[model samples]
Target: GIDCSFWNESYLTGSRDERKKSLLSKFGMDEGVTFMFIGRFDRGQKGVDVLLKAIEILSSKKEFQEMRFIIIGKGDPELEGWARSLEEKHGNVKVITEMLSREFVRELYGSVDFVIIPSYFEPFGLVALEAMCLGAIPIASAVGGLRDIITNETGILVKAGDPGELANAILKALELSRSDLSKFRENCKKRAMSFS
Candidate 1:
């Protein structure tokens, strides 16, 4: 039970700014609704390839000029190679291949505003739970167990495997109601307790 505690350890004990600073240092930039894709780069299951295309579409807009999309993990050289291609084209996307400690990843959860899960056949999105525990919202695809993890109060649901819809959903998350958002942000951690 103690091992499952939310944020109370050497690795987990850190200030919010510390988390943000760590994120920035690792990614080179952290600004304007940073959307995190924290998982393997496997194109078929994780749908990172679709997200790469979504970022391409989002990059065309001036609004997302400063949009920071951070991908953390490793795999699928062909797919990870494509992520690099997007990075070459747009300065806003960055990928980190290092496998992080769970505590560090939990700390990373506190650093972003949203976690986008574009999974095609997601069985269970543990990343969503991790993000929620740290109050970072997840914009997850409605497929398999991801549907159960992300409710209206906890996150934004999107059509699985559709980059255009994902792009549009992210665009909508950007324009979410300020008045309603604060409460939703607060609800993130509380909602995550169900899983805990």
Candidate 2:
């Protein structure tokens, strides 16, 4: 197994602006892509099932086709079943099983336009910080560190388990202009850096 202590330190203290720019260049993603949801589907704490329901509701709309949900981690039987059911119901929803290695997880963060933490009850939500460090906007539940991490300028927050609110948050985030989106990304990174 790879030691994560150094990786964690680097993630927390590394030059964020340089890292963000490098990631954006590597991912080949343009501003046209609106949103991304990331979390462990199999992990009970992260609330993957709730996210799936929200995705199912949002995916029904034509505009949401450009939105992508990248699910990470593996282990929860109930959530897996829920994901499968959503996949069956909505063809646009994307699900990825298996725990990604830390490096790959970093790559995943860098590849997306934004990050989402839809946890029922998250304690710190380090993934949100990590995504922010990489210049990805976070739309997270207003709980735990997520409450602290997302500000009005940094990212948007919604109530947990409310699919309607979550969908609305997605729509609102998508409506941001390019300059507004850039400012949001900058705020997210600045907040993440404060924790370093």
Candidate 3:
């Protein structure tokens, strides 16, 4: 089941530029689009380290200049170390090593274009649901409930654990037009209404 009342209450409430300004000011990212990763710090299952591997690929590509990542959630010791190293080297990577509040998390949902749920295994991709209902597209792996949640109308699904596929999907998300993006937002809410 799903609920939109919580997310829909403030989804897309601000001006587009207002949201853009909020995100851009912090990251200085004036490029394609922002994608977020919000999950527990389980590197093996959540694929936190796997994304770090992909970052090496994305950072090398010229097409990713306008693209950026916002990683939120606390992690294990190894995951934390990788995150720190990635942050030190990559300007496009932002990591928040702590659990966030509901209000702050909601604001983040509004600010980003998409969310990444690159799970190694998930019975149900709950965070992806939260992202969609809150108006952000989700680029998830083709596994578990994540595969089931994503559709042509909702979000993009990539090959699990494959950096190239994840990187490509991300680029496609960045290219989405304003109108198409809105359509996705509308579709996500409608689809969620069904599950609700």
Candidate 4:
């Protein structure tokens, strides 16, 4: 039980501006609606490739110019290469292959507006739980545990293995007003807290 107790409620309860001011620059991120991806580079499973494709699809939009994506993890040489290529093509995209500590990840979760879990088939979807616990709304595939974890009040879910759907969801998330975003953020935290 102790090993699973990685959530810190204080991280989820704070001024978003204050958290962004302190953490964004440290992480070389910019002002915008930030989205993050954290998991291994599994092309068929974790759907890193699909995420990259979605990012590519979003890249051409004018609204996408203001948003930022932070991709974290390492695996699958080809998928990793695509991640770097996407980063090179888009100024708003940042790739981090390093394995970060849980504390650092929680802080990251607090700083971001959304966490993307584009997995094709996730058994338990622990990433969504962790992200929600830190007030980051998840945009995850509607498969396995992801569907059970993400509801309308907490996060967005898309069809598995479909980059177009994921891209559309990202656009939809961007369309949310500040008040609506904050409400979802609060609901995410509350939903995650229910697990305990």
Among these predicted structures, which one has the highest lDDT?
4
Best by TM-score: 4
**Candidate 1: tens digits of C-alpha lDDT, residues 11-117:** 45566556666677666675456788877888588888778888888887887874678888788788778888887777777777768887777777777778898
Write down the RMSD of all candidates, one decimal each. Answer: 2.7, 5.4, 1.9, 2.0
lDDT of each: 0.76, 0.67, 0.79, 0.85
Each prediction's TM-score against the native? Answer: 0.87, 0.77, 0.90, 0.92
Which residue runs of candidate 3 sit more than 4 Å off their true CA positions? 9-13, 28-32
* Candidate closer to the true structure by TM-score (higher is better), 3 or 4: 4
Candidate 2 ranges beyond 4 A from true positions = 1-34, 42-44, 88-91
The better-scoring model by TM-score among 2 and 3 is 3
Candidate 4: lDDT of 95?
Answer: 92
> How far in Å is the alpha carbon of 58 misplaced in model 4?
1.1
The sequence of per-residue lDDT tens digits that candidate 2 reaches over residues 40-124 is 6744467676677678778768867656555554667877777766656554444566766767666556556667788887887
Give the residue spans of candidate 4 off by over 4 A: 1-5, 11-14, 27-29
The 10 consecutive residues of candidate 3 with the worst lDDT sum are 8-17
In angstroms, give how far residue 149 of model 3 lies from its true place.
1.3
- For 1-196, candidate 4 gives per-residue lDDT tens digits of 1123677557454677777656657656668888899988985888888889999888889999878889999997888889998888887888998799998898888888899999988989878888888889999999998888899999998999999999999999988898998899889878887876
Ranking by lDDT: 4, 3, 1, 2
Cα deviation of 47, candidate 4, in Å: 1.0
